[PDB]
Design a protein around this ligand. Structure first.
Ligand SMILES: *Cc1cc2c(cc1C)nc1c(=O)[nH]c(=O)nc-1n2C[C@H](O)[C@H](O)[C@H](O)COP(=O)(O)OP(=O)(O)OC[C@H]1O[C@@H](n2cnc3c(N)ncnc32)[C@H](O)[C@@H]1O
Length: 532
């Protein structure tokens, strides 16, 4: 059952409590609940999404940013980036799989195999992931000549039909620039290729969010309790350092209530909120906790460290003809291309949007339009590393999020981004786009030198909205990895984390489907542990 008033819940004890109903957390709770002998609670600070058309209808997703469904995290001042940038994060069942543009990718096998081979995370490789991406999806390309794909899973993946004539022309321009059309999600990584995306959307226009796909079917299930509108303020531990449950706060008076777990708590509040909850709960860098008056239960110095993202630039053009008035999600094409030789994954990706994107350019005086399109280059393995830290001991205060954009010492991220703006220009200038590409509105053709393009990037960049890696998994003996390879929080028992916080290195592509696969894997790890 769904409980949106804690006063109506009499028994506050469960076998498992999953905190955060987002991409991973919805997957973990649904899968755990498939054993009818265990009880599962899923606790989510935002509201239920059932019946909320602006969340459910994918083509409305742009309206959600900065609304009441967005926690809206500003960043710390940036040494070499855009201090006005905001990390939008959904506050609603489904988490960010409920606010995003549903671009759906399997991660490159080369990214996943490196989690075990290079970063110490035993058992995390493409062998472990592939059957889980298969189990979670119902893909339109499934069939016996593509046996890796799922045809039965709860998350529906479909091909964006090629209806936007500007997008067809842009892919024709990609081909003229030496970037062929490529099929996505075949299991073979695309290093140089472009196409319309696969999106996790249902045939009726509803986003196949983790809440739509995993939770809506099971709300009334006997052993399942969904609690919305309830915000966790700390995890609690007995004198054995065993996690016994979570303290949550209601929206009426801000009273604190305890939910208790007999077996395990899984924390899935995402890459910004998870490290903050662990630190509030005494698990984090000792001197940082002591400076906020928090008693250190585990000195765990990698909590909040290693923050990674896909930083993003934009090139905006005025369109020479009326742009499409309807769309699946307004950002229907992706282009991958390598900026140097010898790579087995592309270092550069770009999105094509059939809209302008002036959120960061208008304040610096760049001209804008109501009829244009955008190309957004992003660095796929940015080398910069940032932090999520407590702003105070009060759980109500937003944390300090400092991605340290464009600070890596070799200057890789700024180099790939400058190459990305040039590449976007070269694509838009091909003869197949000649009836569409009008004047370049940002940065504008006056910006030509590396220095002019770097200044533009520093002032106007955004994010593809993909923060990961702040509570990473790694080797049992690696003290900078807060989790072991079974996603258990080191130094306590009964506590795992499953969300985008766990990645030891960013993936090449948009990460949502991989985060759901992390939730699927966490459920399998728990169910195996329960058997013993
Ligand atoms: C924001 C965003 C993300 C995004 C995107 C567009 C935007 C605007 N476009 C994407 C796309 O088209 N394709 C893609 O592959 N990824 C895209 N992204 C990112 C992807 O959505 C995110 O990386 C992914 O969803 C993260 O999943 P994860 O499970 O790590 O985190 P979450 O969905 O944010 O879920 C966390 C939940 O926890 C709740 N919460 C947070 N704090 C609390 C407390 N204290 N108590 C209880 N609940 C809490 C959140 O409300 C959220 O529901």
């Amino acid at each position: 059952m769904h409980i949106d008033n804690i006063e109506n819940l009499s028994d506050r004890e469960f076998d498992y409590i999953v905190v955060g109903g987002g991409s991973a957390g919805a997957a973990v709770a649904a899968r755990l609940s498939e054993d009818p002998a265990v009880s599962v609670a899923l606790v989510e600070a935002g509201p239920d999404d059932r019946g909320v058309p602006e969340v459910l209808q994918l083509d409305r997703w742009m309206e959600l940013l900065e609304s009441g469904y967005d926690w809206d995290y500003p960043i710390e001042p940036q040494e070499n980036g855009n201090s006005f940038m905001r990390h939008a994060r959904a506050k609603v069942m489904g988490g960010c799989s409920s606010h995003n543009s549903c671009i759906a990718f399997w991660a490159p096998r080369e990214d996943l195999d490196e989690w075990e081979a290079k970063y110490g995370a035993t058992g995390w490789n493409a062998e472990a992931a592939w059957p889980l991406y298969k189990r979670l999806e119902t893909n339109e390309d499934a069939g016996p000549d593509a046996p890796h794909h799922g045809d039965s899973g709860p998350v529906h993946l479909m091909n964006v039909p090629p209806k936007d004539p500007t997008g067809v022309a842009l892919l024709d321009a990609c081909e003229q620039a030496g970037i062929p059309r490529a099929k996505f999600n075949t299991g073979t990584t695309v290093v140089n290729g472009a196409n319309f995306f696969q999106i996790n959307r249902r045939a009726d226009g509803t986003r196949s969010s983790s809440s739509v796909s995993y939770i809506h079917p099971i709300v009334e299930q006997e052993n399942f309790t969904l609690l919305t509108g309830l915000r966790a303020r700390q995890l609690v531990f007995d004198a054995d350092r065993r996690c016994t449950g979570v303290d949550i706060v209601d929206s009426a008076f801000g009273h604190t209530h305890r939910l208790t777990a007999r077996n395990e708590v899984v924390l899935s509040t995402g890459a910004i909120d998870t490290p903050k909850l662990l630190m509030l709960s005494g698990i984090g860098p000792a001197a940082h906790l002591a400076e906020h008056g928090i008693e250190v239960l585990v000195d765990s110095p990698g909590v909040g460290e290693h923050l990674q993202d896909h930083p993003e630039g934009v090139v905006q053009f005025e369109a020479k003809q009326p742009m499409v008035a309807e769309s699946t999600q307004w950002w229907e094409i992706g282009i991958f291309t390598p900026t140097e030789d010898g790579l087995d994954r592309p270092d550069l990706m770009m999105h094509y949007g059939s809209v302008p994107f002036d959120m960061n350019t208008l304040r610096h005086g760049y001209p804008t339009t109501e009829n244009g399109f955008s190309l957004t280059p992003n660095v796929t393995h940015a080398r910069s590393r940032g932090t999520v830290r407590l702003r105070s001991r009060d759980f109500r205060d937003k944390p300090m999020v400092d991605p340290r954009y464009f600070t890596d010492p070799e200057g890789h991220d700024m180099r790939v981004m400058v190459a990305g703006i040039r590449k976007a220009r070269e694509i838009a200038a091909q003869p197949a786009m000649a009836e569409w590409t009008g004047r370049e509105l940002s940065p504008g053709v006056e910006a030509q030198t590396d220095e002019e393009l770097q200044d533009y990037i520093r002032k106007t960049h955004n994010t593809v909205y993909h923060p990961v890696g702040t509570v990473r998994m790694g080797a049992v003996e690696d003290e900078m990895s807060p989790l072991d390879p079974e996603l258990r929080v080191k130094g306590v028992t009964g506590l795992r984390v499953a969300d985008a916080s766990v990645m030891p290195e960013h993936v090449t592509v948009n990460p949502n489907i991989t985060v759901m696969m992390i939730g699927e894997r966490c459920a399998d790890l728990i169910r195996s542990a329960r058997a013993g």
